[PDB]
């Protein structure tokens, strides 16, 4: 009840966010901007050349430094503004040490660092995984380098995970006899340390950039297949970490490069909302029609259906991409005739006989044909010259 009342007071504070003077000064604007930043689209703040607001110009300057360095020093002089008339900059160990020596009341944060000698650094657990920074050639184009593929569709994938009923887990999950400030604080720390620190190890070797992990949610942009594969790896590891008792749902999107960033996050947020409907332990893959379970996508869609198709078509001289498209057309309609045409297509498809019977069986039963369609679509994207 104490935590519910604190959040209840917080929600009341959020409703009446502003006061009389703050609201009036919001509507007391003297000069229209007549010029806006490309990213922040803010006209009230002073915009310099390159058509960038002062905040976002600092944000871009923080980039190309976040990848290289691991010390975030809050100091009187820096790139992006911070409260108490301070600014935030990302510097190396020598640069941060300079800054703290120059002027006192300067804080320095170290990212994912093991404990070191006596210093005024504060350890911040932050997920900074970025596959592009590993290769200097791909470091120039951070996330757009995952679009570059020898084979496969160039589209990026956006993963938005979110733990189901985490608030209900803290309030109702812990029984009365085991609820305390210390027991709850441990649960907050284990969940925090999984997202902030363990996510980097889970997505190791994958073309994935971690925009955020932070406590309960997740945002990753990378190769479309790497995002899907590491979504299943992360789901399995999350089940091990939580030992059951906690499921998370995720939306996965397929968006090209130059797709709007706001639309990439919004449409995947919509997908996660779809996966949040029902028993909440679901993944919404690509379209809103493919809201599968985590076991269903990992096992039924991919291993049970997509892998047999990929192996069979690789064995032939050409990797399909013409039987697969014709299969999709015959699977999109509900006609009795299209089933017969699918039977003829499989017979002439020149693959193994027991696989054609399996594909025909899959198309027969609803909730099993949609798995077959997603298996075909995943395979089609896997092979796009």
């Amino acid at each position: 009840d104490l935590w519910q009342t604190v959040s209840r007071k917080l929600s009341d504070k959020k409703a009446h966010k502003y006061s009389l003077n703050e609201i009036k000064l919001f509507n007391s604007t003297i000069h229209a901007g007549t010029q806006e930043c490309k990213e922040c689209l803010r006209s009230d703040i002073d915009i310099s050349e390159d058509s960038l607001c002062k905040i976002c110009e600092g944000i871009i300057a923080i980039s190309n430094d976040l990848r290289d360095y691991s010390f975030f020093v809050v100091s009187p002089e820096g790139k992006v503004p911070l409260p108490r008339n301070r600014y935030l900059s990302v510097e190396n160990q020598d640069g941060a040490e300079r800054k703290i020596k120059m002027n006192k009341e300067t804080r320095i944060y170290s990212k994912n660092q093991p404990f070191v000698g006596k210093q005024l650094v504060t350890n911040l657990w932050m997920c900074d995984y970025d596959f592009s920074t590993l290769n200097p050639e791909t470091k120039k184009q951070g996330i757009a380098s995952y679009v570059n593929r020898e084979v496969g569709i160039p589209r990026l994938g956006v993963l938005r995970a979110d733990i189901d009923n985490l608030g209900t887990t803290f309030i109702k999950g812990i029984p009365e006899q085991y609820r305390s400030i210390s027991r709850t604080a441990t649960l907050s720390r284990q969940l925090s340390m999984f997202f902030k620190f363990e996510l980097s190890n889970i997505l190791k070797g994958a073309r994935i950039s971690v925009i955020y992990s932070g406590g309960d949610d997740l945002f990753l942009i990378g190769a479309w297949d790497d995002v899907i594969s590491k979504a299943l790896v992360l789901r399995k590891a999350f089940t091990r970490f939580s030992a059951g008792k906690l499921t998370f749902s995720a939306g996965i999107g397929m968006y090209p490069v130059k797709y709007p960033i706001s639309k990439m996050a919004s449409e995947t947020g919509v997908l996660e909302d779809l996966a949040k409907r029902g028993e909440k332990n679901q993944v919404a893959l690509w379209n809103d029609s493919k809201v599968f379970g985590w076991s269903q996508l990992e096992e039924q869609i991919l291993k049970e259906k997509m892998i047999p198709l990929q192996e069979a078509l690789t064995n032939s001289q050409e990797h399909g991409k013409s039987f697969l498209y014709k299969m999709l057309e015959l699977l999109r309609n509900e006609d009795q005739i299209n089933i017969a045409r699918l039977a003829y297509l499989l017979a002439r498809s020149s693959l193994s006989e027991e696989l054609t019977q399996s594909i025909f069986a899959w198309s027969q039963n609803k909730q099993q044909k949609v798995e077959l369609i997603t298996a075909i679509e995943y395979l089609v994207y896997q092979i796009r010259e």
Partner: protein
């Protein structure tokens, strides 16, 4: 006072129309998100008519006042509001009989100059029998420029009938033919009995 003229009719497909963008399709056409029916975007009709009218005239004031402008000093509201041409109900019923799909996959290739090998391609096209209900609104900002503008609309539509809509219509696709069901002034006192297209 201000008048608006509603030109409504049919865009009969004369050859498979592909305006690029349900599942995975090789070069799919643009479709209505809800009904999943192939559509002809109004921006595609507007752009192709503007492109053909720009070539015919020669940006020119005639094109700018007809398709809109945003240049400094001369901001002209677009008189032509060409709505999305949606797949007609008549062609849906007509295609339901014959169980004919609304769109067809056209298979081609590209025989290389260096190696003489054929690299196949697929572009989805709207089938020939398709018909799209087009709905154009012409805003009569000038009662003196309406006759000259409707002459330009007829010229741009005549060029569009001899050309292709979106897609690789130089290789056959996109050919269309307009039919005008009616030209009625929905708003204002302006009369369009004399006005006509084609």
């Amino acid at each position: 006072m201000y008048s608006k003229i509603r030109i409504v009719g049919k865009i009969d497909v004369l050859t498979g129309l592909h305006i690029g963008g349900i599942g995975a399709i090789a070069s799919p056409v643009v479709r209505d998100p809800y009904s999943r029916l192939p559509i002809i975007p109004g921006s595609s009709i507007k752009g192709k008519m503007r492109s053909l009218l720009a070539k015919h005239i020669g940006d020119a004031p005639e094109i700018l006042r007809l398709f809109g402008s945003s240049q400094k000093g001369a901001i002209q509201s677009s008189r032509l509001q060409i709505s999305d041409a949606f797949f007609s109900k008549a062609s849906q019923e007509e295609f339901d009989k014959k169980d004919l799909a609304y769109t067809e996959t056209k298979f081609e290739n590209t025989i290389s100059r260096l190696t003489a090998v054929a690299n196949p391609r697929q572009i989805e096209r709207v089938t020939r029998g398709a018909s799209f209900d087009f709905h154009i609104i012409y805003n009569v900002e000038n009662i003196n420029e309406v006759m000259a503008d409707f002459e330009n609309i007829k010229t741009a539509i005549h060029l569009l009938e001899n050309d292709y809509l979106g897609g690789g219509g130089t290789r056959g696709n996109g050919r269309i033919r307009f039919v005008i069901d009616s030209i009625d002034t929905v708003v204002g006192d302006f009369d369009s009995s004399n006005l006509s297209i084609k």
